[PDB]
Structure formats: C-alpha cells, structure tokens
C-alpha cells in the first residue's frame, strides 16, 4: 500500500542497475520505515 512511485525521468529496464534521486524527503521517510 504505497503510492505509485515518482519515476521523474529515470527509466529502469529489466535486469539493469539504475539510480533514482528525487528531491523531496517524504520518500526518505518511507525508506527509513522499511528498515
């Protein structure tokens, strides 16, 4: 039950490492909640 992610110009092809750098900190709150 998580909001649809903000891709914000970051394609992620299957089986391919990729980096995402959103400027908002609310997703960081989700990142700390998942630990």
């Amino acid at each position: 039950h998580l909001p649809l992610i903000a891709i914000t110009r970051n394609p992620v092809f299957p089986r391919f490492i990729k980096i995402i750098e959103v400027k908002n900190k609310k997703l960081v709150e989700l990142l700390r909640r998942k630990v």
Binding site: T8, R9, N10, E21
Partner: protein
C-alpha cells in the same frame, strides 16, 4: 578544460529542471572557441536543427 564543470553538473537533463533546452544548448555552444562571426552565422540560422 577551460571553464568549471560545475555549471554542467548544475543543469543536467535528468534533474527535470531544464525548462529551456535551447538555452542550455546555447550555453554549451558558448564554450566553443569559434570566432564571434561564426556565432553570428549560427544566429543567422533560423531552424533549430540547423
């Protein structure tokens, strides 16, 4: 190297802040050492791809 790369790091295509691409490409064409007349000749071009 001529000028600092930090302006290139400031305006990246992945940050979604690049609201005026022609100005970024002109800012990138400014680094060229070509003579001012060559720049005026590029200004004579009207079509964007040209």
């Amino acid at each position: 190297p001529l000028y600092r790369e930090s302006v290139l790091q400031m305006m990246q295509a992945g940050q979604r802040v690049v609201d005026n691409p022609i100005y970024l490409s002109d800012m990138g064409a400014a680094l060229t050492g070509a003579e001012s007349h060559e720049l005026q000749d590029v200004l004579e071009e009207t079509n964007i791809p040209k």
